[PDB]
Scaffold this active site. Structure first.
Site, PDB file in Angstrom:
ATOM      1  N   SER B 510       0.854  -1.194   0.000  1.00  0.00           N
ATOM      2  CA  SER B 510       0.000   0.000   0.000  1.00  0.00           C
ATOM      3  C   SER B 510       0.886   1.239   0.000  1.00  0.00           C
ATOM      4  O   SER B 510       1.629   1.440  -0.981  1.00  0.00           O
ATOM      5  CB  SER B 510      -0.996  -0.117   1.153  1.00  0.00           C
ATOM      6  OG  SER B 510      -2.144   0.696   0.927  1.00  0.00           O
ATOM      7  N   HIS B 623      -7.790  -5.904  -0.645  1.00  0.00           N
ATOM      8  CA  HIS B 623      -6.608  -5.261  -0.063  1.00  0.00           C
ATOM      9  C   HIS B 623      -6.141  -5.945   1.212  1.00  0.00           C
ATOM     10  O   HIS B 623      -4.951  -5.876   1.555  1.00  0.00           O
ATOM     11  CB  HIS B 623      -6.914  -3.791   0.218  1.00  0.00           C
ATOM     12  CG  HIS B 623      -5.700  -2.921   0.403  1.00  0.00           C
ATOM     13  ND1 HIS B 623      -4.910  -2.506  -0.651  1.00  0.00           N
ATOM     14  CD2 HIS B 623      -5.176  -2.340   1.513  1.00  0.00           C
ATOM     15  CE1 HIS B 623      -3.946  -1.720  -0.199  1.00  0.00           C
ATOM     16  NE2 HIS B 623      -4.085  -1.604   1.111  1.00  0.00           N
TER      17      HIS B 623
END
Ligand code: NA
Ligand code: NA
Ligand code: NA
Ligand code: NA
Ligand code: NA
Ligand code: NA
Ligand code: NA
Ligand code: NA
Ligand code: NA
Lengths: 651, 650, 650
Positions: B510, B623
């Site tokens: 990320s 994610h």
């Protein structure tokens, strides 16, 4: 009656005619949409007595019918088994029998000249063989190449292409080529000794775009490279005497803008000639329409005496037939304001069967006199529709752009407009950009006219139809003069046709046309409504996400991201989002991998961020070709969202 | 005897303790992975005789147990019906019975103080009512900025409804209207007033204040307690009902703003921020891959009302503090560990603490609040902790290029002997406003067990070190944050002899992925890099990420139509020509926080330029894959990371 | 090589030829079993140039092809849609198209003489209409005698409708009402009149006359042509439409009544029974396990209208004859073989015959109607006939205990050289009013192949020998029929030295299973016995068999409330104490002709008395298993028969 969106369900597209060897009848294909809103295509026969009869019938698709050399069998492709395979229908009675059973089916096929076998193209994974047959925890996918996905089929597995001989009786299969990275067009010589095919033999196949013609001696199994990197080629055709091989090709001197020319090779002499090297005309069919889009066009067809080749060509909104003699002359043979999208030439006579579409005629077969250029109707495949519903015609005009360059356009008037009335104008912009609007049937355009809009559609520079300089002009100049050409047409149509309401203008377009729709609303406020489709808004992301991004951007816009990011950004419609004050409907499909849906999301988010009028419609499971060959119910929805948006904001 | 990847299947996370109202026993949750490689969670009781016994058993997930005010029933949420619903387990005998049958299930619930009902949060389409029950082609028209989430994918925009559920009959009655969004909610001890967090803005997706609404249960009348003064969560009424506490902030520093303790006095119409002068973030900002979905405690009032107990994140620790109303704040359960769950005894200065540390997966402890001494109550990873050698995380500090002090941790491969050296892998956490620290981290143990020294740091932008430190990264992406990390590699090389300075790798996800990408485009010292769920192009990020329409502006500094060249300057893709480190790109197909197009752009540019890179794409994962995704895929991601470093570092 | 059980999978049955109207070609059917052990059948065409060509190919069954009057279309029935429907195949090019879509399918059809429509037979429940299309608890209340069938289980009481189907549109129109039952039907050559056989009795289940109804196609007005005078099948109009031929009888000997040729003249209201004084059964009574469901010809008019070509069953033969309207009857196609399909040239004196014999499975032959000489047209079993040795059936005659001459046949095992002896298996055919004879019989070859001499005979009760002989069994079950068979065994031993008189076995099905059961309770001569789909208790048979409510009366002689002790005296179960032959009992669970309770009672009584017996139950099969049943189960049944004789006879 007047054209409705649901009339696309009635449309029938005849295509792909082929003569029986005696020249007395022809097989062709009719593609339709059935009661369950699913596509179907079936074989039909035009017979000596003038009768037109259907020969296949199921809930499936039959395609590419070819008569055997004896005339006793109609070979064809069908997906009725669950994959596309080669089937054999007797020419004189009996049902079809399935010949091939490849796990991955068959893409294309030719007859051997002796009729004992056919040559089929299949594909194989590295762990698969031609003996693998159709059979009707989680793992990450590892990507290691630039070309790893396609709009047509999504994630690729890198299957290699194989040409196989299939015995007509036994169905026994034997690989003729090795496992090729890519096989295009292929054709076997009239004496049965040589198989020519187009292959990608480059060391980096994804990044090199030349394509070689390879000759395979069937007996010796030896291959020789005919072209050795001199260009790219398609539509191979051996001459009657087997001493010459014709191909459509070019040398990539203008990348995707390069005109396609007629090549003729002499394999025995090792020489080649570009017959139309001095004719500034693009061979083949660049025409833009939403009907017949998947129809099998004809490549070059030799004249029975081997003296030259009948070729179709795209000029000035027409796709017409020409004859290119080996001696020099290039002469028209079938000319007119229409789209010739299918062609069979009689084995001996000066006669042809031609599939022809025009703005007021969906599509039908015609017998054509090769010597006098006249035609007679053979089919009336859309008779009820054409007898009931009024078609608007497309009237061509020309205008000069801001630099004096002459541009061609067409206008259609709403057939419900009585004199003294004015209609709002919808500008349609075609994709490509190296494509060509023109004289072909276009259901979308009919629907807009019938819904009360004047329809303008033009060929701005960058289009095909007007020669090498014009089609090339847009490269490096995205949103420059191409955009001026279109706005010049708006102004020119307003001045030339009083039935246009100058105060009520709309614009729509897909792909490149979607880039140009987005570009327009960021550069002028002249339009009251805009509909962008399968569009582009950010060239920087496009390069890395589109299935062809890694060469298209460089080829068309001018550079890659790591060369000149700011030029890419400057030519990106998203840069101008602050200026956009025209209600913009954004249409896009989830599985469109030619123009990724992230292109539509970026523009929709920036407009919403800035408080602008916009709406995003996402079509499930469809790809870039939705409007031509996608789910018919979604084609209806796409058309209704287009029309409703202009209705809301133009009317 | 050393950690392997498959050990993640063995891990059990004990979490979410709650005392019975008589204080004599407590219920908690144990989450695990079964032999089908599927997540289960079950209820457990600690019963004061010292016994811990399992109380639910099936192939499902039980969550969020809470005793009724009388102690005779244990409510809990379970997906055993096919959707998450409220069930009731008798506290003294009998199996659980289903209470709610909502079509869209229950998100959360609280007991009523009299025990006759429970308040549940459900969601309804416009065409739905609280009466619809669970039961086993057209384009999508999108008209709003927040139309998808990484958690759910495309959103249908159901609105939130809080409903009262009668405990005996299951009869349901709506209490709120159809809210755009309902967050924390709590009911006053006298049962008359329901407080809940709501999005009352006219443009809900672009305005980030959240209001505390007070709803008179009898009349259904509502008053807005906060009128846009900030955003709020974790509501907790004082014992006498005259005060409402919450965790919140005023957005002065956007996503980097410290969370603080607020107390409201509704009847006097006043509010005060009780930790306004305490430069510590309240809550749990710890980075780990275990206990990720474990429910944190929320602030707990002292019986006498003189203050509240709150967890807070500082210097790699998540500890428990007491904030008195007068101002002074004490640590009451402190140490180099992660307090990831908490119950406080009803009448005594005792607590039950779920505590993880680098060498302890996690267990429950009875804690004396008077002195902070602990008694272990569970040993949920006894087998693994007895057979497998854990590497400790050793903390250190170092100065950045501009002198600023940075904290980091080093891990040394347990099988390393005195003279030997190992290649170093730098791990970079995401957020960026998150905090590496003293918690169990399976992936870091696997790297150590694989023969890598492991460095992980809290560069500026991290939480744990005060409001200035966490805000410093905003508008300076790839500036001093990059310097902090590189200064950390240098300092680690200097301070720790077991590091092989000739073999350095870098990996992160990320923001840590953006930073890995940034790093290989600005330096060549690393011989290997693995970027994960990463960012390469801020211009496309803003338009595609589920939060891109505010994150880029909030964090990088601007939107694409404000300053696109600034976004480009901070985009790692801009520097792809400098990239000479073998770069494995890991990304999941259904990650909508960082869309896969970010990885695709970087992969393509590298391949175009003939650089060494591979793209590994995980199907159906989002994610949070590395924490709560498909365990088989979690295994594969760990293998792909270790294999890349094995290839280029050993 | 010699016959194996699995050779039944290789067998192909050519059948049902029909000439195109120009007489140059004929379409026929080939039924086969594919690699999945499923039945398929496809259309083939023979042409006067000698070619034999397959015209349909898919995984289904096509059958009953018929050229249209002009010959441009080949109508045919196919189940490829999932129901049997009428499909049309172009005669000269193109694939077939489906014409009908009835929910309940099509049972039969005829062409209109003008080629513009076809008449199809469908069935309908009372709530259904001809518009209902194929679409690919409740206690059952039963109120009638005929409430189930072996062919289709419990019957739902659907009524039959004949509907006109336009060829072009497929538009359908009911011609009849809902008929209790419809049999044969035929449209007159001028298109004005539809003839069909109906059950017009007030009590349809208990009255067995069947009427020929005439329906005017224009008005739909109906007339009863026969008014109860008999029962009729195989209607055929004369070329000039003035006469209607039928195969019929007046039930004077119930199920044993000879079938005769009737010719009606509807307009004159007169009729002739043209074979009334010819003591021969018309039609095909042959017993075999191949060609079982092949459509026989029915009577065919000479093109000049002077008389009819009829098949007849006599002395083991099914042969062709001509019956002149002027009286004389002459043979046309004669020999020791089974004529099981036939088409007669539309204008010339030629025919196409499908012919089976004991050593030829079955093929098509060009036959001259002038002299009966024949030319082979097909060779559908060429590989099999080239590779496996067939045992021929040698006929012989012998006298029974009362002097009555009986005909039988013997088969010698092919592997048996002169001098050696083989154990004998007696096969007993069912019916009883059927006929062993000159036809290919896979079961019998397999027995011969397995080393058994095979005896099969036509005791009194058999067809093939005149009215008196076929009638003689009625009221005398287990009397002289049993004597006939025993005398056949003695005679065979006396005449055929290759029979080992010390090793005798017997088997049979239905009636022959009753006889097998009777035999072993009346004699101990046999060392092994296999009884199939058999009968042991006439009392319960009456009430449980689909036809028991009339068969027992018609055959055994009385109903249970008439003379139960007579039924018991003729029940094989009554003699179970006498049984000392190892008896294998073979039966199918869904045989409703002979219900499995018949097999169970005999099994139980034998077990109660400690006799050697085994019971083998075939799942999901019915009475016709051995001919048209699941091929894998057909192999299992043949396997169990041979294994039982192998165990006790060798
Ligand atoms: Na047409
Ligand atoms: Na549940
Ligand atoms: Na610390
Ligand atoms: Na932005
Ligand atoms: Na690098
Ligand atoms: Na045969
Ligand atoms: Na029988
Ligand atoms: Na009797
Ligand atoms: Na049976």
């Amino acid at each position: 009656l007047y054209f409705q969106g649901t009339d696309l369900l009635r449309l029938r597209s005849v295509r792909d005619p082929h003569y029986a060897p005696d020249g007395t009848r022809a097989v062709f294909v009719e593609k339709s949409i059935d009661e369950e809103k699913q596509y179907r295509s079936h074989l039909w026969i035009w017979a000596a007595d003038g009768s037109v009869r259907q020969w296949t019938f199921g809930r499936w698709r039959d395609m590419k019918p070819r008569f055997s050399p004896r005339g006793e069998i109609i070979a064809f492709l069908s997906d009725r088994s669950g994959r596309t395979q080669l089937w054999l229908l007797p020419a004189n009675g009996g049902e079809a029998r399935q010949l091939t059973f490849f796990k991955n089916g068959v893409r294309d096929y030719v007859w051997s000249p002796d009729g004992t076998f056919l040559i089929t193209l299949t594909t194989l994974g590295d762990d698969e063989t031609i003996e693998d047959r159709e059979e009707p925890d989680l793992k990450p996918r590892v990507v290691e190449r630039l070309y790893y996905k396609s709009d047509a089929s999504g994630f690729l597995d890198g299957k290699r292409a194989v040409l196989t001989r299939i015995d007509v009786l036994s169905g026994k299969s034997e690989a003729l080529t090795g496992r090729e990275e890519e096989i295009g067009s292929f054709a076997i010589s009239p004496n049965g000794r040589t198989l020519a095919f187009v292959a990608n033999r480059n060391e980096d196949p994804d990044t090199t775009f030349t394509r070689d013609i390879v000759l395979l001696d069937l007996e010796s199994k030896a291959e020789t490279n005919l072209t050795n990197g001199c260009g790219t080629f398609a539509s191979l055709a051996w001459s009657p005497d087997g001493t010459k091989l014709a191909a459509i090709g070019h040398d990539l001197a203008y990348l995707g803008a390069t005109l396609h020319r007629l090549y003729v090779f002499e394999p025995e002499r090792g020489t080649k000639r570009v017959l139309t090297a001095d004719w500034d005309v693009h061979l083949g069919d660049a025409m833009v329409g939403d009907t017949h889009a998947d129809a099998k066009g004809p490549g070059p067809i030799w004249a029975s005496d081997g003296s030259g080749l009948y070729v179709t060509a795209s000029e000035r909104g027409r796709v017409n037939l020409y004859f290119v003699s080996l001696a020099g002359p290039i002469v028209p043979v079938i000319e007119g304001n229409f789209h010739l999208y299918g062609l069979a030439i009689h084995p001996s006579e000066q006669q042809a069967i031609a599939a022809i579409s025009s703005p007021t005629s969906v599509g039908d077969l015609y017998a054509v006199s090769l010597a006098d250029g006249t035609k007679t109707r053979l089919t009336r495949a859309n008779e009820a529709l054409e007898n009931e519903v009024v078609f608007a015609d497309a009237e061509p005009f020309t205008y000069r752009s801001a630099d004096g360059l002459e541009i061609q356009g067409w206008i259609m008037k709403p057939p419900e407009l009585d004199e003294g009335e004015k209609a709002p104008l919808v500008v349609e912009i075609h994709g490509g950009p190296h494509a060509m609007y023109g004289f072909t049937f276009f259901h979308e355009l009919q629907l807009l006219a019938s819904s009360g809009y004047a329809v303008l559609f033009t060929n701005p520079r960058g289009s095909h139809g007007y020669g090498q300089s014009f089609v090339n002009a847009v490269r490096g100049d995205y949103g420059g003069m191409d955009y001026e050409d279109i706005m010049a047409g708006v102004d020119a149509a307003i001045s030339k046709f009083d039935f246009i309401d100058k105060e009520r203008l709309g614009v729509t377009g897909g792909s490149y046309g979607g880039f140009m729709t987005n570009w327009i609303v960021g550069h002028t406020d002249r339009f009251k409504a805009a509909v962008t489709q399968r569009s582009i808004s950010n060239w920087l992301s496009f390069s890395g996400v589109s299935d062809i991004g890694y060469f298209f951007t460089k080829w068309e816009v001018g550079c890659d991201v790591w060369e000149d990011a700011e030029r890419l950004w400057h030519h990106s419609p998203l840069k101008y989002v602050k200026h956009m004050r025209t209600p913009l409907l954004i249409l896009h499909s989830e599985r469109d991998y030619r123009c990724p849906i992230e292109q539509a999301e970026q523009l929709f988010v920036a407009l919403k961020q800035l408080g602008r009028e916009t709406k995003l419609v996402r079509f499930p499971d469809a790809n870039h070709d939705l409007s031509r060959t996608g789910n018919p119910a979604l084609r209806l929805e796409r058309l209704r969202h287009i029309v409703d948006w202009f209705d809301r904001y133009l009317k």
